[PDB]
Design a protein around this nucleic acid. Sequence first.
DNA 1: AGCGTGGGCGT
DNA 2: TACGCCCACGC
Length: 87
Amino acid sequence: EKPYQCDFKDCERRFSRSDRLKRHQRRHTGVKPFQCKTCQRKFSRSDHLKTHTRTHTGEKPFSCRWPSCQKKFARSDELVRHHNMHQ
DNA sequence: AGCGTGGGCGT
DNA sequence: TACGCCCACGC
Ligand SMILES: [Zn+2]
Ligand SMILES: [Zn+2]
Ligand SMILES: [Zn+2]
């Protein structure tokens, strides 16, 4: 069940926990509570701030597993796309 | 390619 | 609630 309904104009989204609704509603309000301390860009979410910060350090914790391919990536989804490309 | 960001789901 | 994962879409 998903009783936490979004009531913004024309929106039908519904969620199972209050914070999931709150997270979603930032897409309507444009509120960005989290700020990068390196470049001062602001973000709606702390998880997306965290992956953003890897753009400044070069940290790429996700490594391709194909032999003789040295490629690494900042996020899991970039590695999925890459592994899909090797086939 | 690299990464913003919206949403599912977890602890 | 804080914090964060994964996946998917769109530049
Ligand atoms: Zn909404
Ligand atoms: Zn930054
Ligand atoms: Zn590879």
